[PDB]
Amino acid sequence: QRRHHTDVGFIMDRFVKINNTNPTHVIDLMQTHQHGLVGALLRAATYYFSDLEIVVRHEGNLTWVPNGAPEAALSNAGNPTAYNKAPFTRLALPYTAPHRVLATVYNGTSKYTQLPASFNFGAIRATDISELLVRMKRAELYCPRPLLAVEVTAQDRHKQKIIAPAK
């Protein structure tokens, strides 16, 4: 038997759109749509570790400040600045969070329903951002959690129309 298409490191290695984009954006993997392939297969884990690659469609230059840097540092070009080409920009970011692994659910708070603000990958800024795609490289998952399929109201099972060569 071949079990390569259900691999955790293989199913996570694809681009996924992040719907919420702002002129200043904090890159967090929990902004993915919860019902997509990557989003739903990610909420079915407790902890995770990953690198990232992003495709951004911006005007003007793009600045990236790592995790923990002040917000005022986004207005200086000393931090890695990317000059815009025609179609878009591809960048590869590392993992900079202080914790060894991140999490998708947190039981409580962290200040002396909402995850701590320290669960992010950095931030990006430009004069505006039109689209943003993210990609999880070398992903790993821990402590599985329930994964649910679509419900059936009164039928025997869900019916979805498949692609057919009918003319």
Binding site: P80, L141, Y142, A149, R157, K159, I162
Partner: protein, 221 residues
């Protein structure tokens, strides 16, 4: 001189799942190791195979109750990952993201009934053959069936064979193709002693040679 190259037409575009990497922007970052972290899973089907999950019978309960009527048919339920009974299962949750599947599926029966009650049952699987499932508890003996009595164990596991035409079967049962799609399982009660509200909980897990093939993103987004 310098090397001559030809800029091909049609190549170079961005594809969501291309296998080529990007250019780094921030080097020399060493992250703390995540070694010896308990509970690391690398394959979804391994988790599906290891831990069974309950079935959802009628009215929204995970057990079937003994019936005091002439119909010896305790119940039937479709064997399909898109069926109504397998709606609340981890296996169906994984399978909703793939197009084709092939392999065995296991069934777990566990007797939570009282010790002072003894009974006899049988289970029968019917592949997509005759137009009507053998509702008769005797007609189903000609199928591939098994017999278990709650006198030597309270646990009994039954394997569902893979029978179809092609090599791989669809996971996303089509709007067309009516009549029993492929398979149904019906459970009969040969006899029962003082079992009026005695319970029977059924759970389903992946087989040893199960496999899912083509990843898709089918939901409405």
């Amino acid at each position: 001189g310098i090397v001559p190259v030809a800029c091909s037409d049609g190549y170079g575009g961005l594809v969501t799942t291309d296998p080529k990497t990007a250019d780094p922007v921030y080097g020399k970052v060493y992250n703390p190791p995540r070694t010896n972290y308990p509970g690391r899973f690398t394959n979804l089907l391994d988790v599906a195979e290891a831990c069974p999950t309950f079935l959802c019978f009628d009215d929204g309960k995970p057990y079937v109750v003994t019936r005091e009527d002439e119909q010896r048919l305790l119940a039937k339920f479709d064997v399909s990952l898109a069926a109504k009974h397998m709606s609340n299962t981890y296996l169906s949750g994984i399978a909703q993201y793939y197009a084709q599947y092939s392999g065995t599926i296991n069934l777990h029966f566990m007797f939570t009934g009282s010790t002072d009650s003894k009974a006899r049952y049988m289970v029968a699987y019917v592949p997509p053959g005759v137009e009507t499932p053998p509702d008769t508890p005797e007609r189903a003996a000609h199928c591939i069936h098994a017999e278990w009595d709650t006198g030597l164990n309270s646990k009994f596991t039954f394997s569902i064979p893979y029978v179809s035409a092609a090599d791989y079967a669809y996971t996303a049962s089509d709007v067309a193709e009516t009549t029993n799609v492929q398979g149904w399982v019906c459970i009969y009660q040969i006899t029962h002693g003082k079992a009026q509200n005695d319970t029977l909980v059924v759970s389903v897990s992946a087989g040893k040679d199960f496999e899912l093939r083509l990843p898709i993103d089918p939901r409405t987004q």
